[PDB]
Design a protein around this ligand. Sequence first.
Ligand SMILES: [Mg+2]
Ligand SMILES: [Mg+2]
Ligand SMILES: [Mg+2]
Ligand SMILES: [Mg+2]
Ligand SMILES: [Mg+2]
Ligand SMILES: [Mg+2]
Ligand SMILES: [Mg+2]
Ligand SMILES: [Mg+2]
Ligand SMILES: [Mg+2]
Ligand SMILES: [Mg+2]
Ligand SMILES: [Mg+2]
Ligand SMILES: [Mg+2]
Ligand SMILES: [Mg+2]
Ligand SMILES: [Mg+2]
Ligand SMILES: [Mg+2]
Ligand SMILES: [Mg+2]
Ligand SMILES: [Mg+2]
Ligand SMILES: [Mg+2]
Ligand SMILES: [Mg+2]
Ligand SMILES: [Mg+2]
Ligand SMILES: [Mg+2]
Ligand SMILES: [Mg+2]
Ligand SMILES: [Mg+2]
Ligand SMILES: [Mg+2]
Ligand SMILES: [Mg+2]
Ligand SMILES: [Mg+2]
Ligand SMILES: [Mg+2]
Ligand SMILES: [Mg+2]
Ligand SMILES: [Mg+2]
Ligand SMILES: [Mg+2]
Ligand SMILES: [Mg+2]
Ligand SMILES: [Mg+2]
Lengths: 129, 122
Amino acid sequence: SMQDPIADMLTRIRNGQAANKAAVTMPSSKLKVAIANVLKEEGFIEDFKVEGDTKPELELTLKYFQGKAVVESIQRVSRPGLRIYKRKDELPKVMAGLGIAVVSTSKGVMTDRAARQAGLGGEIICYVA
Amino acid sequence: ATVNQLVRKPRARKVAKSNVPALEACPQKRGVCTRVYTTTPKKPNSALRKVCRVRLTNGFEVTSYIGGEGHNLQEHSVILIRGGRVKDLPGVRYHTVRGALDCSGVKDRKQARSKYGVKRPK
RNA sequence: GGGAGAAGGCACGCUGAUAUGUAGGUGAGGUCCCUCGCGGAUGGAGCUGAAAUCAGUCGAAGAUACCAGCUGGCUGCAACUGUUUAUUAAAAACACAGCACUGUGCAAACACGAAAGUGGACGUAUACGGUGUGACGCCUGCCCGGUGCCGGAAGGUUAAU
RNA sequence: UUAGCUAGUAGGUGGGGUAACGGCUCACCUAGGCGACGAUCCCUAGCUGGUCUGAGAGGAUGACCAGCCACACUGGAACUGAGACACGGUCCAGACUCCUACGGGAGGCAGCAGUGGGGAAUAUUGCACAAUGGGCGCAAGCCUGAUGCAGCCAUGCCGCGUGUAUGAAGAAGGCCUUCGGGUUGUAAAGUACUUUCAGCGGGGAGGAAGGGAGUAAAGUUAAUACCUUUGCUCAUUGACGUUACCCGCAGAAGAAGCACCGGCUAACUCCGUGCCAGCAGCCGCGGUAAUACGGAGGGUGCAAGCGUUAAUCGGAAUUACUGGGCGUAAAGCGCACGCAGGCGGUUUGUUAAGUCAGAUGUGAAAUCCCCGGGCUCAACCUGGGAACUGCAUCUGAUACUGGCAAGCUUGAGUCUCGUAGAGGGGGGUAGAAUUCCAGGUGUAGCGGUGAAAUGCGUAGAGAUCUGGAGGAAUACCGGUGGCGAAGGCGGCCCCCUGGACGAAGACUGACGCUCAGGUGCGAAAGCGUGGGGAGCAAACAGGAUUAGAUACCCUGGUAGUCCACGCCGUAAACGAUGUCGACUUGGAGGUUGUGCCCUUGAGGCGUGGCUUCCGGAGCUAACGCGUUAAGUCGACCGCCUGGGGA
RNA sequence: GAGGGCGCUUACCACUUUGUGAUUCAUGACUGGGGUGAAGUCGUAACAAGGUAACCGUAGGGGAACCUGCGGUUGGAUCA
Ligand SMILES: [Mg+2]
Ligand SMILES: [Mg+2]
Ligand SMILES: [Mg+2]
Ligand SMILES: [Mg+2]
Ligand SMILES: [Mg+2]
Ligand SMILES: [Mg+2]
Ligand SMILES: [Mg+2]
Ligand SMILES: [Mg+2]
Ligand SMILES: [Mg+2]
Ligand SMILES: [Mg+2]
Ligand SMILES: [Mg+2]
Ligand SMILES: [Mg+2]
Ligand SMILES: [Mg+2]
Ligand SMILES: [Mg+2]
Ligand SMILES: [Mg+2]
Ligand SMILES: [Mg+2]
Ligand SMILES: [Mg+2]
Ligand SMILES: [Mg+2]
Ligand SMILES: [Mg+2]
Ligand SMILES: [Mg+2]
Ligand SMILES: [Mg+2]
Ligand SMILES: [Mg+2]
Ligand SMILES: [Mg+2]
Ligand SMILES: [Mg+2]
Ligand SMILES: [Mg+2]
Ligand SMILES: [Mg+2]
Ligand SMILES: [Mg+2]
Ligand SMILES: [Mg+2]
Ligand SMILES: [Mg+2]
Ligand SMILES: [Mg+2]
Ligand SMILES: [Mg+2]
Ligand SMILES: [Mg+2]
């Protein structure tokens, strides 16, 4: 039973990067598009696009820099069954600022750094390094 | 394993028992000698190590070991049992700290006198 | 299923209230209906009538007379009810349900019968007789040397004729 | 390895009672209340701010002090009093102690000191109310074993000193010595210098603020009387106190010990025994030198302390939430169903519980940390700040989880047409073969073994034929072929029936996954009853081997293996790999279905399910897994924490 | 006289007493198993194809390791 779509997306992109794939098509979602927007903004991916009327499908394009995959480690944090909620003071920092610790809060899902800048906490979604 | 299983059954500790049961969290215990004798240690070691079956004042009766060279212990002697085991002596778990009420210090010793109750030479 | 009425303990007289007799039971007369009588719905008039609560009261004693279990623990035997020496032994003695063996194909075995015949049985191998042990749980381990029983007539002996 | 507890107990009606609400209690009514989110029961335990360890998370803990609670020889009770069921107030009961003239009476130091007893271990029968309070009093004034101090203890922390510049004949002596030298060693002697601290003789702040005796102004008041307030100078009050502190005396005096030296760990050389004495925290040492025991030299470390013991934590990621594993080191229940519980595809609307931001109250004081100050300095004290990571309330957000509502099929499931299969249950029938029964031929052997023998034979054994009886399973098919959740299923037919897969469709609409407790199935062996029993075959007998053989070799041979109905839930029940969803290079096959192309031949291209062998990345301690992963993740359950004991 | 004291009684009630259960501790003739050891006695069961392949569940038997039958595994070596 598919009980976590975010984990499925992370697994798909991590396997595509390992297998040196070009595009990873998957069934999309509102949160998937919101996370893909953050990935495009942070430059960890190359492009994301939602193509579908009745069943929307996200087709992300993998980004490669001199052979090495741009994303080093993708990790789910607040998996279903263990929810993590940290305030503004205790927001995580991935790889001493070299990685993102994406946070979802009231003002959308922008990123950990933007959440700290705005002064609001939230729930951790994905660690991308 | 899983967080739900941990919440259900807590990650319990593992209580370890002390190696000096007859002390009851006490450094020294005064007792009276009952059986003074010598025993042969386990192989490959071989000796005539001097031990003593002594009954403590709390009620426990254990066997301790006499250190140094030469002692004046016998039946109906008051000694001060101290916590410490001997590896090559099966059953011995304690010693008799010298300089106590009756177990005098070792004779003709001028090094490590703190552990054997020997006075400072003049 | 039982031990068990285990052991042990509490109240028991009388009077007055609840209730001038209660809960309950029986059950009048007057409306009703009949395809009308020994009838069918209401009715509690009358009679009978527990059990308990509260208070008071008299005696040393209120299941006050008669009648009317002493109790527990260990242990051998027999499972148990029962039966047994009329008239000194009622028991561990017999029987018992259960178990095992054996014989028995019906005109059955067996028994009473000189015999007819009968019982078994107006039954038919889940039926009947005999012999051992004797509810139930764990089981019935070795031996045919000897005496019985069953199967054989290759050989030896063997009556009457 | 504590699954039920409670009959004033749940609640209600009415009355009585405390300062009030209250089964606080009685009198009636409704049988409820608590409990797998641990009721009830057992053991232990004062709680907290705090303390120690740890980077943190955590673990242990409650010394001093502070706040709360409970108790005054033990149990019960009540009175006064605002305030108690009251440490030195009351009564009774039990024990102890002590007077009695035997009728009778007195006491409770877990208060401050001290005594007896216990223990490894706890200190004086000290001064003062001078300061702070408390109690009483208009005030003076009285009491305080609170308190302020005095004495002992290295019990804990900190500071100081126990000298110093030198000083080579590298004095002397000691130690070993390759006997030429080295070590102690600038160490010591000697010289110059200082006198901290201790002793002597003196000065000597400060903790002391007030109070009484007098004089004035104001406030009163008929009244400067009387009183209060405000001031004013004088006479006054100290346990510490031989006060802190400073000054001069003279001399280096009056002051250093403890542990270790093979590795962990900082430090090596000789002498003495000789697995003896002995060391020991682990590895381990002592059997003529073990740098490991004892002695010496030397060095190492700390220092008025040094080591051991007692206890906690780190290391121990060795209970892992931070921060682990289950194929083989310990770890997937034998399998399936399923309750509670956990999680949950996709879109929108509503709310704001979880979440987030701000503010308020609070989180006592003491304590940690930061910035400063005072004792000559530190320990110590102190001011401010921070912190107390927590809770409650109010105000705003819906991205996410959850509550509600309205939609979708991509998850799940149904119908329609077909396909394969030893899937399960029940009943029949064919055949080979084995074993018996009877008969016909039939003559000296048969069977068996490494070798024989027990065993079967002239009473006709073994061989063959004929006829008949009985039980089991179905030679070839037959394959890493097929099915089944697992266990497991194989001649053929008949009846019932479960499950699985495929082209093209239609349909409900999250109905989905896991699942402690529970339920069901479940190899063989085993047990009970009723049957049957051909062959095989535990136990058992005999023969054989062996020094011995209660066994492997052989001949018999009962239970059992065959059937029906019942009990257990045991296997290396294995793929030593739990159930479900998604992704990840490839090759060579087996089985089963379907689509298309000219199917002239299992010609060619595709497309789903199961299954088999290699093999890339990746993983793993490695064997090995490798699209059916042991590669990366998601949801859940079960299990593991050294080997024995077990 | 009201009302209050002494006495008496009733209700609650401590000490104490009776019977029967539950749990824990110590002891107890005798008895089973387990762990330690020194030149003690018997056998060779496992490790090779350990010389009868091992191992598991079960039942029986034996002084003992073990043996046998049934069902499963290769965590057995050779090999048509
Ligand atoms: Mg009536
Ligand atoms: Mg007798
Ligand atoms: Mg008997
Ligand atoms: Mg009888
Ligand atoms: Mg008689
Ligand atoms: Mg009789
Ligand atoms: Mg008899
Ligand atoms: Mg017999
Ligand atoms: Mg005979
Ligand atoms: Mg005969
Ligand atoms: Mg009541
Ligand atoms: Mg820890
Ligand atoms: Mg006392
Ligand atoms: Mg009190
Ligand atoms: Mg005292
Ligand atoms: Mg005072
Ligand atoms: Mg010299
Ligand atoms: Mg060492
Ligand atoms: Mg581990
Ligand atoms: Mg193993
Ligand atoms: Mg294992
Ligand atoms: Mg399994
Ligand atoms: Mg300062
Ligand atoms: Mg504080
Ligand atoms: Mg929602
Ligand atoms: Mg069977
Ligand atoms: Mg045989
Ligand atoms: Mg034999
Ligand atoms: Mg297993
Ligand atoms: Mg399931
Ligand atoms: Mg492979
Ligand atoms: Mg199997």
